[PDB]
Design a protein around this ligand. Structure first.
Ligand SMILES: Nc1ncnc2c1ncn2[C@@H]1O[C@H](CSCC[C@H](N)C(=O)O)[C@@H](O)[C@H]1O
Ligand SMILES: [Pt+2]
Lengths: 265, 265
């Protein structure tokens, strides 16, 4: 009669919370999805070893369309767990699954876990200064998305930082890199000429948040566009006007140019 | 040799990640501060038991003035852990402590944990639609803080949601309730008369996130200002323009008035 939405955390199998692991252990059935994001710091096997249960993976369609024919039925007579990377209900569509539960007579509880939304705090930028978020999507065919460009403009216009998730083809295991993201934005700046993203724009790159050795780099596009940030996942951030304390962090912890202390404050 | 910043989580001692626990367990000295947030589902005793180490708790002064005198010295000879509620670098000024660590020749590592900043997802509001954040501070003496009010206005103008952290006076054991935040906002509305916060405004209240049964309620200020949401911590949210699915979630899961279902696009 109970369904648990349990977050798996940021990077590896140790990133799940104690509460999430003990509840998952007492569940009769354990499902998981890996299309909204991947756990690049681990594998399905390791997660199964840690949980001690057989984990049935669900595709985007299993979740979006048939969640009620796959997960809810069993949750009607047993205790089920639905594992997701990061924090549950950050994925725009997951919240609705709680409504599907209710109409099926199934109760549901949420067990939180670290999300990249809070972890960006490791970049030293204040959390209250992050504005609207966006996702940089790969262009394809005759389609060239650019709304993420306008999000940056509106945020920075108000002195706000912009958090940009990079594109991901989970099934294919293809991660967009900060580098490609920077290439797209430059390609967009060229077409919209709004003066939002150029070689002189200051940006921050966070890679493998959750790991003990994340890559935190800050600098101007012209310098980082071809820098190696390591393995995925990559998160890109275009900060607004910096607070002096913010800039000092980037310089001392993220290897930012001393220049940002007078140019971006 | 090293300093670890380990987040404790939202509600109780189980909200710590597994990675966080296994690391804390192997540390020589464990410190912690419980003034930046409130973990209402546990005690220091339960945390000490889980970690199997004694925990010396620090005050805001110990930390803000003597972190490098109390904690750092030990980090040069041992593995030291500094524990905090939620995520260590979210809505705190601890990020700067990593610079003090650097200037003392101490490598530091961050272990994240569930944060109220990402747990807002349980309210059904799309987390990418949250704009600038703010804190509703306690007026004291003749000083009456009001800046969080302009933050709401600016967000609402863009259709973005506003996350409001509520003030906390740990040493006086004071934890601002959503009710108190609403009272203060109304008073600020009288002064500025900008039409940003009134009896007819729709608000959302999340109390004790992280617990299995948090209180999630959405409705008009005139109806909620006097409602009892349970023990703190409280967070107050002022939604921007609602998308249909956000509205349905608020109606289905947060007991919101069924009229918010009809959206004005
Ligand atoms: N579990 C919880 N439920 C409701 N609100 C909470 C909460 N935890 C913290 N808060 C809100 O957040 C404020 C503290 S700000 C610091 C919180 C911590 N850095 C984190 O990442 O969550 C509290 O005063 C309250 O306004
Ligand atoms: Pt600041």
């Amino acid at each position: 009669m109970v369904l648990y939405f349990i977050g798996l955390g940021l990077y590896d199998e140790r990133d799940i919370t104690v509460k999430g692991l003990e509840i998952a252990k007492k569940c009769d059935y354990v499902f998981a999805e890996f299309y909204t994001s991947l756990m690049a710091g681990t594998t399905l096997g390791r997660i199964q070893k840690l949980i001690g249960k057989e984990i049935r993976v669900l595709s985007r369609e299993d979740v979006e369309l048939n969640f009620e024919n796959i997960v809810l039925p069993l949750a009607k007579e047993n205790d089920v767990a639905f594992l997701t990377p990061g924090d549950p209900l950050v994925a725009t569509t997951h919240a609705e699954l709680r409504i599907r539960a209710k109409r099926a007579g199934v109760e549901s509880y949420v067990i939180h876990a670290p999300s990249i939304y809070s972890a960006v705090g490791i970049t030293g930028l204040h959390i209250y200064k992050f504005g609207k978020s966006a996702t940089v999507a790969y262009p394809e065919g005759n389609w060239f998305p650019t709304s993420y460009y306008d999000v940056i403009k509106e945020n920075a216009e108000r002195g706000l930082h912009t958090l940009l998730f990079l594109d991901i083809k989970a099934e294919k295991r293809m991660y967009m890199t900060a580098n490609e993201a920077m290439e797209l934005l430059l390609k967009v700046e060229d077409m919209k000429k709004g003066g939002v993203f150029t070689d002189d724009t200051l940006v921050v790159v966070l890679a493998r948040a959750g790991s003990l050795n994340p890559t935190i780099r800050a600098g101007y596009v012209k310098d980082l566009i071809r820098e190696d940030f390591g393995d995925p996942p990559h998160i890109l951030i275009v900060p607004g006007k910096l607070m002096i304390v913010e800039a000092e962090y980037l310089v001392e912890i993220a290897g930012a140019p001393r220049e940002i202390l007078r140019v971006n404050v």
